[model samples]
Target chain A: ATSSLEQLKKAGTHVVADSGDFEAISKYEPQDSTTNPSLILAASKLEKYARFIDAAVEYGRKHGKTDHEKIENAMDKILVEFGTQILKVVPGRVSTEVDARLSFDKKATVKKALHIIKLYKDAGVPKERVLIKIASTWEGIQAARELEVKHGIHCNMTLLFSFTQAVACAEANVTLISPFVGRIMDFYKAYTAETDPGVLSVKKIYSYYKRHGYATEVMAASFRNLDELKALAGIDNMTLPLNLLEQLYESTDPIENKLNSESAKEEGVEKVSFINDEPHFRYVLNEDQMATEKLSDGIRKFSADIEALYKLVEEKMLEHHHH
Target chain B: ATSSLEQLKKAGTHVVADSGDFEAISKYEPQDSTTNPSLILAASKLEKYARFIDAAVEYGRKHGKTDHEKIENAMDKILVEFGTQILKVVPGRVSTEVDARLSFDKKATVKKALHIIKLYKDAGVPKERVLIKIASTWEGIQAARELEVKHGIHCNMTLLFSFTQAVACAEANVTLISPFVGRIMDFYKALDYTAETDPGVLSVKKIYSYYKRHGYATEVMAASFRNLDELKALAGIDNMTLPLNLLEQLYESTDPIENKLNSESAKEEGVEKVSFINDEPHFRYVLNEDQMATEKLSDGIRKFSADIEALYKLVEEKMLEHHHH
Candidate 1:
C-alpha cells in the first residue's frame, strides 16, 4: 500500500493521521494529526498505548509531580510526548488539545491551552512544534486567539462543521484548521430523504474555502471513505484517519487533488467572505441549537476520552517496579 | 385512526409538523412546527411566496416601508398572513424565520425578529402566537435573547444539531428550542454507529431533560425526525416536529399515554446549569469543519416547503382582482 505521507508528498497534500498515539503516528510519518471524542476514546482502550502512560508516570515520579494532579499531568505528558515524536518526523506542527471541559469558557480555555503548551515546554519541546487543539466553539476560538497572537502557540481548531464556524476561525487567524468529512457524511446519510442530493454540507465547506482564500489551512478530518477523502483533495490540508489513510494508500493510484479552488476562483466571480471569527461566530452558533449542542457535546466527549486515557494510564502505572 | 392531536394529547406527545408552508402547517396542526434553510430557499424561489415581495410592496406602498431594510418587513407580512391563518387553525405558535441570509448576524437576527413581530401585529395576529425562528448559531441565540426577554417576542431557535447550541439557548431563556432528531441519526449512521452507543453524540433525552430539570421555561421542541424510532426515543420532549406521514403513523397505535418527563425524572438525572457560548473564531471554524452542522443546515433549507408561498402569491393576485371588496 502507498503510505499516506508518500501520497501526500507526491500530491502536495498534507496527510494528517487522525490519532494521538505517538508511536503509530511516528510509524506513519503523517505530516499532521487530528483528535476528537471517539478517536481519543478508542486510543485509550489499547494496551499498546501503555508505554505513553508509563513514560508520563516515570517523568512525573522523577520530578515529584504527584497524586490526582500527577494523574492529570500524566495525560499532558503523554500528549506532549506524542507531539514531540510526531513533530520530529513531520516537518510541520502538531495540535495538542486543551481540556475539553473548558470548551465554552474563554478564560478557562486560554489558561488551559497555555498550560498544555507549558507542559510541552516542561518536557523540552518548543512551542513552534505544537498547535493547541480546542473545540470550534466561541470559547475554544477565543482561547486559541490567546495562544495564536499572545503566546505564538499555533492552534488547530477542531470539531468544525458549519460555515459560520469556519469564517470565525479564519478571522482569528489560527495557524490551521480541520473540517470533518466523515461527520458531514454522517449528517447527509441521516437527513437525506432517500432522493435529496448527496450531502449539500460538504459542497458548502469546499466552496467556502475556495471562495475566500482562507489563510487558515483547511484539513478535512474523520473521513468515512476515500472518495469523500479524495473529493476534498485540494483542501489546503486534510487529516485522514489511519483506517482511511491505509485504504487511500491501497486504492488510490495517483491522488489528484479534487478541491479545485483555482477553478472556483477563475470564473471571474469575486468570492464573498464568510462571517469570520469576530462577534458573529458566537451569536451565530447560539442562534442554531444544533451547532450549540454539538459543540458542547464535542467538548464533553473529548474531555471524557482524555479523562479515560488518564485513568488507564494511572491503573497501568501502578504496576511499575519501585525504583 | 384518531385526530393527531387526540393521540398527541393522550400520549402527552408533542406533535410537530415538519414543514415551512403555513397552510400545510394549519391543515396538519402538529402541536409544534419546524423550518430549515431549504424551506426558506424554496419559499424565496416560489411565485407563491411572491406575496412576500408583494406584501413588502404593499406595506411599503401603503404605509411607506421600503428598501432592503424593510423588505424583511414584506417577508414579515407574508409570515403574518401565514401565521394568522395557521394560528387560527392550530391554536399554537407559528414559526417564521429570520432571513436565512441573516443567520450569522446577531443584531440583524434580533431586528428581523422584532420586525416580523410588528408585521404580525399589523396583520392582527397577537404577539403571543408568533415564534421568531432563527438559525441556532451562537450569534442567532444572542439575537433571540433580546426578542425573547425584552420585546415579548417568543423565539423558536432552529438549525440545531448539537448540544452546545442547546446549552446556549437554554441559558438565554428563549421561549423554546428545537433539536433536529433526524440530523443526529445522520451523524451516527455515517459513522457506522448508533445514537445509543455512539460516543460521538450524547442522548437527546439527557439533553432536553437537562433543560427541563434545570427549570428552563424554554420548551424542548425536537424537530426533523427520520423515523418514528427517533421520536419514540425522545418520547417526553417538551414538543416534537414530525412530518405528516410519521405523525399519522404515530396516531394509529393507541398505547395509553405515558409521561416520560416530570419533576421526578429531572431530579433523578440531577441536571446542571448549562453555560457556554463559543467565540466567533472557535464556533465558525468548528462549525465549518463539523460535518453534522454543515450538512444538516443545508439539508434543512432544501427540505423545507414551497406551497404556502404559492398560496400567498395566488391570494395577492386575487386580492388585486377583488380590490372593490
Candidate 2:
C-alpha cells in the first residue's frame, strides 16, 4: 500500500520525484524532481542523456576558441539540455551545480555561476526557473552571495548540516536553504543509538528560521525512512521520491505540525559564528568528528556519483547513435 | 663548485635558510628565512623546541576560551619563539605564516592577523621584526593591505608563482613581496620552454621594478627558490631569502650586481597585467596545472604542516602533564 505512487497521491503531501530519468518521472506524476552532479554524471554515461551531452559539446567546440573554453561551453550546453528536459516534466526550478572542483574557490565558483545563469537566460529559462546549487561551505556561500547580489541568480545552498553553515547562509541572504534532514539524522544515528528526540535537527532549524523570520524556505530532503518524513511534517518544503510520496498517501494517520519559532528562542544556542571560510569551518567541523566525517564522506560519494552519471550519458548516446 | 652556501655568499647575494629548525638555522648562516604552516608544525615536535612549544601552548590554553582561540595563542606563541631564534641567526625579519587554512577567507584572515600581531607584541616581539607571511592571492593581499595600513605589521606575501600573484601583492602596498624566482623558472620550463627570457623570469623582473618605480617602499624578496642562476639574475632585488647554498653559489660569481631594475627602466618598459583576477576555482585549476606552483605549494604544506601537528601534540602532552591535557 505504501510503495505505489497512487498511494502517495492519497496523502496530502506533494510527491516530488528525484531522478534524471525523463521517462520515469511522468509515470509517477512527480510535480517536480531534483538532479545532482553525481546523478548527472551517471545519466551522461547512460544512452539516455548521451545525445544531449554530445550535441551540446559538439556545438561548443565548433564555436569556442580554446580547449578549456570549449569544455565549459560544452558543459553548459549539456546542462541546458538536461534542464530543458526537466522543464518539460516539472514546473519548478532545476538546481544545476557549478563544478564541485570549484567549491572552495569563490571567485571561480561565482564566475561559473554567472556563466550558468547567462546560458540559461540565453536558453529562455527564466532566471526564476533555475536554481544554481552550490556547496554550503564558506567559499560556496561567498560565491552564492555574489551571484544573488550581482547577477540576481537564485541559489540553493546544498550539503547544509551545521548551524554555522545555516548562520552563514542566512547572513548571505540566500534564496533557499536545503537543511538535508535525512543526512543530518543519519549522522546522529551513526554516532548514537538513543532516539528520544531524533528530529531536533529539523526543529533546531525551524526555530532559527522562525526566530529570524528568514525569507529562505527550508526544504528537508534525502530521507532514509518515513519516520523522518513524519518528524519533518511542519517544514516549509519536503522533497520526497515518488516511492516515499506514495507511502505517505497510503497512511491514514494525520501528521501534525511540530515546529515553531518561540521554541527556538527557548532552545537557542549562544555560540555565535559568522564564519564563511575553510580554516575556521574545518576546525569547527573537526571538533565534531561525526558531522565532519559524514559531510566529507557525502561530498566524495556524491562527487563520484556525478562523475559516474556523466559517463552514463555517453553510453546512452552510443546505444542510439550506433557509435 | 657552486652548490654550497659559501659560493652563493661569495656572489654578493644574501643566503637565507627557511625552516622551523632553530638549531639547523644557526648552522646554515643564512641572511634571512621564511616559515610557513608545515615548518612551524615540525619545529613544535622536536625535543629542542619542545620547551618553547610547551611554554607557548600553556600561555595559549590558559588565555583563550575555545580551541579556536587557543590555536591563535599557540601559533603566536610558537611564531615568537621561532622568530626570536631565527632573528638570533639572521639580522633580517623572519616571515611567519598565518594559518594557510585562512588562505581563502579575507576578513577573518585580517582579523586573526591583527590579533596575532597583538599577541606577538605582548610576547615582546616588536611589530617591525615580524613579517606576517600570507599566501599570495587576492584575499591574502587584501588582508595584507589592512595590516600594512592599520597595524604596521610588515607583510611578506608568500606562495607567489604568477604575475597575477606579484601584481596583486604589489598593489596591496605590503611591506615586502617574496616573488619566488625558482618557482617561476621551474613553471615556465614545464609549460613554456619557448619562454623568451630568463632574467629571473620576465614577470618577476617587471614586478620587481613596478614596486621600485612606484616608490611604494614594499620590498620584493625572491622566494621558493630552485637554482643558482635564478639567484644570481635576481641579484639587485630589494632582498632575496636564499637557501644556504643558493647564496653560496652567488658568492662565486665575480659580478653579482648586474643592473636590471631602475626607475628609468621600470617606468620606461614596464609590462603590466590587465587586472587582478579573483576566482578560487580558476586559480586552483590553473595552479594545479603549473608544475612548480602545484608541486611547491603541496610540498611546502606537507613538510611544514606535519611538523606543526607534531608540535601541537607535544604541547598538548605537556599541558596534560601540568594543567591536565
Candidate 3:
C-alpha cells in the first residue's frame, strides 16, 4: 500500500508543494508550499480567490499615497495573502517572492525582503514560518546574507542555474537554494539534445554541498516529468507540482535514497570557494552561457507576470470605486 | 599647417562623421556619415532640428491610420530626414539605421531596410548613396544578404564586438562592419583595469588582419573611440568614424600619423583563417560562448531600443497636444 511518494518521504526527503491551489495543497498534504508571481497571478483569476484579491486591493487603497505605490502595495499584499492562506494548509513554511525587477539591486532587494517579512508578521504569521524568496544573482545572495545575519528571516535563493551561483549562495550561508532542474534541461536539450542534464546538475550541486560541509539545503525544483522527479528522489528536498505529485501517489514504484551525505563526501571534488571574491564570481557566472541566458530569461518572465498581477489589481481597484 | 586629421586622410583612410549635428558634419566635411538612435535622439532635441521633427510628425499624421503606425512612421522619417540632410553635407553615402527592436527578425529587418531606402529615394537620394545600418546579429546579417543580393541595398553592420561577428558579417558580404573600440575596452576595464592593454585596439587589429589576410572585400570600420590614443592606434583602418570631440582633437594636433593597418603587411602576419559561418546554430553558439560579445550585443540593442521608445513618446505627446488644440 506504500506509494512512491510515501517511500520517498520516508527516505528523509522533504516534499514541498510547488503550487498556489489550496485544494491541491490539502490533497497532497505537503510539509511546505512555495508561491511565485506566475502561480499567484493564475490563482487570483479564480472565483474562489476573489475575496483575497478584493481585500488586497482595499489594503493598497488605504495604505499608499500615490497610484504607483498603491499598485506596488497591492502586489505585495496579494503575494502575502496567498502565502497566508497556504500556511493555513501546510505545517512547515511558505515562500513569498520579492519582485524580480529588483533582482540586481542589493539594497532594494533587502528593503523588499524586510517589507515582505513585516507583512507576514502583520497577518499574525510568525517569521519562522515564512521564507523570503529572491533570485540567485550576486546582489541577491549578498542581500540574503544581510537578511539572515541581521534579522532572523530565512532566505530561499530561486532561479539558480549555475555551479558558481550555487557556490556563491552556499558561501553566503542562505537557508536553502533551489537549482532549477527542468529549465536547465530545457536549455541544454534545445542546444545539445541532452535528456537528463537537469538531474545531473542537481546531483552535482548536492554532492558539492555535502562534500564541503555546507548546510545550505538543496531543493531540485521545476521538474518536467515523473522521471525527473524520480531521478532526484533522494535529494535533500523536492518541490513537485500537483500533476507529478499525483503521479507519484498513484504509482506503486519502489523508491530508495539515491543521494546521501556520506556518499557525497566520498566524491573527489576539490573544495573550491567563491567567498568574498565578487570579481571571480561574476566572471565565472558570465562565462557560463546556459546560466546567463536562463537566468535573464527567468527574470524577464517573472517581471512580466508581476506586471500582469498589477494590471489585475488596478482593475479590481476600479471596481471598488464603482461601488 | 597640416594637422593629424589631414595627415591621416593623406594615409588613404576614409574618415566618416559619427555625429548627427549638421554643423559638426559640415565642419568636418567627412566623406560619409552614420546615425543611430542615440545620435538621432540627441539631435531631435535641438532647436535647429525642430523643423525636421515637425516635418516627420506631419508625415506620420498623413500616412498612418493607427497610433502605433503613426509613431513608427514618424520614427523612420526622422532617421531618413537626418540622413537626407547629412547626404547634402557630404558627397559620399549616409548610413541610416533600422530599428534595433527588430534585430532578431530577418523578414521585418529586410522590410524596414527597404522602406528606409524608399524614403531616401523619395527625398531625391539614390540607393547607391545610402548604407542601411543593421545590428551584427545572425538574423540581421542574413537579412542584409537578402537585401544585398535581391534588392541591391548595401549594409553596414553595427555593434560588432567579437571576431566571430566580424567573420560572419564578412562571409555574408556586408559592405562594412563597425567594431566598437570603446565599449569593449569599457567591459574589460571594469573587471581588470590595465590602461595600456587596450583590448578594443587588439580586437580591431585581429579583425582587420583576418579580413585582409583572406582577401575579403568587406571594409573594417573602427568606431566608439575613447580618446586620441585609441584613435592613433587604429590610424590605418579602412574607415574611421570619429565623434565631434575626436574630430576636433585630430584637427588641432600636429602629430605625424602612421599607417598601422596595412593590407600588404597583414597578409604576412600569422593570423589564422576561418571558414564561413553559414549555419545559424553554429554562429549563435559561438557568439554565446563569447561573454563580452554576448553581453555587449544585447546591451547595445537595449540602449538603442530605449532611445527609440523615448523618441516615440515625444511624437505621441506631440500628437496629443495637437489634438487638444
Candidate 4:
C-alpha cells in the first residue's frame, strides 16, 4: 500500500504545494510551491506567522507615507517575503502572483511582473527559480508573451478554466498553466455533472498538448476532493493544499495512472490554431461560457482577498498609531 | 557675541540639516533634514552608520529582484529609514531625493516622486513630513508643480544656482527651493566676493526679495554655504540647511549676526514680478542663457547620477560577495 501523492510522484508527475505558509511548506517539503492572494492573506493571519505581517507593517511604517500606500507596499512585500521563505525550503521554482487588477492592462501587468522579478533578483534568486503568476485573460496572455519573449522571464498563467486559455497560454509559450479544477466544478454545479469537468479539463489539455507537441506544462490546480487527484494522476502537475497533501501523505491508498501519452494520440481530434490576435483569442474565450465565467470569478475572488488583506492592514495601522 | 546659527534661529530661520549621516543629524538636532545621492553616499560610508548600509542591503536581499533594483530600492529605503529616524528628532520635514536620472523626464520624475512619497506613506509618514527632492532641471520643476497642485506633495528643488531657476521654482509654487551658494561662488572666481557681494549670496537675496514682494509662498533655502557669514546674511529668509561641520563652525565662532534680509525690506525693495513660461522648453531656454545655471544644472545632475551609480556598485559588490559565499 502506497500513498497516492507518492504514486503520482512515482509516475513523474510533479506536485506543487499551493499555499503561502512557510511553516506548512516546510513541514510537507513539496517539490514546488504556488500562491495566490487568498493563501497569502490566510498565511499572514496565522498567529505564528503574524510576525510577517507585523514586520511588513513596520517596514511600511518606516517606508510608506500614506496608510493606503503602506498597505499596498506591505501586501507586495508580504507576498515576496512568503515567496522568499518558501524558496528557502523548496529546491524548485515558486509561483508569485502579480496584482489581478492589472489583469486587463497588458502594459501595467508587464511593468508589475518586471517589478516582481526585480524584487526576486535583488534577493539573489535566479529568474529561473520564480514564475511570474498571471491571470489567463487575453491581455495577461499577451503580457506573458511579452515577458517571455522580450525579458526572458517565464510566467504561470493562472485562473485558467478553459481549453481556450490553455491553447492561448501554450501559444504564448507560458512556462506553465494552472487550470483550476475545483473552480470549474463549482461553476457548473446543480446539474449533477456526470464526470468531473474540472478534472476532464486538465486531462483533455494534457492529452491535447501532448498530442500536438505543445511545450507549455498543464498544472491541475484547485483540487477539492481526493477523487480529482486520483482521477488526474498522470497529468503533468497538480498544486494541492497542505491539508489535502497531509491526508494523501498519511493515507495508504493504491493509485493508478489514469493519464498517459500513448492514449492521447487520437486521429479524429481537431488541431485548432488562432491568428495570435486579440479578437481571435477573445472570441474563443467568449465562446466558452464556463471558461469565461470561471476565469473572471477567480480573478474577482483573488482581488477581493487582496482588498480584505489591505483592510486588515489599515486596521493594523490604526492600532499601531494608537500604540 | 552671538553665533550666526543661534542668531539665525533667534531671527526665525529653520536650520535644516543637509546631510544623511544619522550621527551628524542626531548631533545637530536640526529643525529639518535634507538628503541627496551624494549625502546618502557619504552617510553609507560612515563607519558608525555602516549598519544602515547593511540593513539596507539586507532589506534589498529580501525585497529587490535584481542587484541594481535591489540596491536602488535599498538606497531609497535607507533614505526613508534615515528620514523616519530623523523625523522622530526633527519637527520639520525631511527632503528625500528622487533619482537624478529622471532630471530630464517630467513624467518619469513625477512617477519617481510619487513612488518616493508612496514609500514614505507606506511607512506611516505623512505627506507633509517628506519633501520630495528633485534636481532643478526644467522637467524637475514641472514635476514638482504637478506634485504640489495635483497631489499636495511638496518638493525641494535642489541644484539651484541661478536666479532663473529660483524664479521658476517660485512661479511653480513648490514647497521649498535650495539655491546653492557655494557652487555659485565656485563657478565664478575673482568676482569681488563678500557676504554682500558674493554671487551665490546675491542670487539668494534677489530670489528671496522677489518671492516676498510677489507673495509666492515658496520657501527659500540657502545651501552649500562656505562660512557663517553667508548663513548670517541669509537669516530672516526662510531656511538654511547647513552641513554639520558648518553648523559646528558657526557654533564655535563668535560672529555678530544681524537680520540683513527680511520680508519688510523685500516689500520696500521694488522687486518686479516676472511672468514666466511654465513649460520645460522655456524653462530650459532661459536657464540655458545663464551660463552659470546651465553648467551647474548639467554638472549637478551628472554628479548626482554618478553618485547613484557608485552607490549601486558598492551595494552590488556587497550583494555579490554574499551570494558567492
Q: Top model by TM-score, which number?
A: 1
Q: What TM-score does prediction 4 earn?
A: 0.49
TM-score of chain A, model 2?
Answer: 0.80
- Comparing 1 with 3 on DockQ, the higher-scoring candidate is 1
Question: What lDDT score is found at residue B288 in candidate 1?
Answer: 46
Off by over 4 Å in 3: A1-323, B192-196
Candidate 3, A149-239: lDDT as tens digits? 8987899999999888998898888999999999988987782213488877887898889988899999889988767776677788888
Off by over 4 Å in 1: A1-52, A58-68, A85-107, A133-143, A156-171, A176-271, A275-308, A317-323, B1-56, B60-71, B85-97, B100-105, B123-144, B156-325
DockQ of predictions, in order shown: 0.09, 0.10, 0.02, 0.01
lDDT of 1 at B312: 43
Cα RMSDs of all predictions? 8.5, 10.3, 23.7, 25.6
Residue-level lDDT of model 2, residues B1-325, one tens digit each, is: 4343454445344556767775766655676778777667666767777678777877888887876567556667878778777877777777788776566568877877887778777767787878888876456778898888877778888877665566656666788777766656665566632223763456677776666555557777777666655555555555667554544444444443453445555655555543443444555444433445544544444444455566566556665575553
Each model's TM-score? 0.61, 0.55, 0.56, 0.49
* Runs in model 2 lying further than 4 Å from the true structure: A1-15, A48-74, A99-127, A146-153, A181-203, A224-233, A240-323, B1-280, B284-325
Q: Higher-lDDT candidate among 3 and 4?
A: 3
Tell me the lDDT of model 4 at B242: 88
lDDT of 1 by residue, B11-120 (tens): 56667676556555554456655544455445455767565545554664354333432343344555565556557667577777776656657887787777778777
Candidate closer to the true structure by lDDT (higher is better), 1 or 2: 2
What DockQ does candidate 2 score? 0.10
Candidate 4's iRMSD: 23.4
Per-residue lDDT tens digits for candidate 1, residues A192-280, read 32122222444565566556766677676766656565455655677766776666565536666555566644432344333343544
Full ranking by lDDT: 3, 4, 2, 1
